[PDB]
Structures are given as C-alpha cells and as structure tokens.
Copies of this chain bind each other. A is one copy, B any other.
Amino acid sequence: SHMASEELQKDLEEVKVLLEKATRKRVRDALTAEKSKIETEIKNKM
C-alpha cells in the first residue's frame, strides 16, 4: 500500500537504475533530489 516499505524500495531502485543511465547534470540533479526524498522516507521507518 501507499508508503509501505516495499513500495519505497521499488521507488528507490528505479531512481538508481535511471541515475546509472543519466548523464546530463540537470537531469541527474532532478533524480538525485527524488532519491534523497525516498531515502529519507525509508530511514524514517527505522
């Protein structure tokens, strides 16, 4: 369900897959901002 740990892990994995492909700074910055948000949501679960 919404905001379940497994859903956040799937979000994070996709952002990492796309960061491996991305080369443009502007696009990488947008992806890294999302990555940071998802990682915080995961860490918040402790």
Contacts and interface: CB of A to CB of B under 8 A. Distances in A.
Interface of A: 8, 10-11, 14-15, 17-18, 21-24, 26-27, 30-31, 33-34, 38
Interface of A is mostly: helix
Nearest to A8: B26
A30 B11 CA distance: 11
Contacts of A24: 10-11, 14
A7 to B, nearest CB: 8
Contacts of A23: 14
Contact of A30 (B10, B21, B34): B34
Contact of A14 (B15, B22, B33): B22
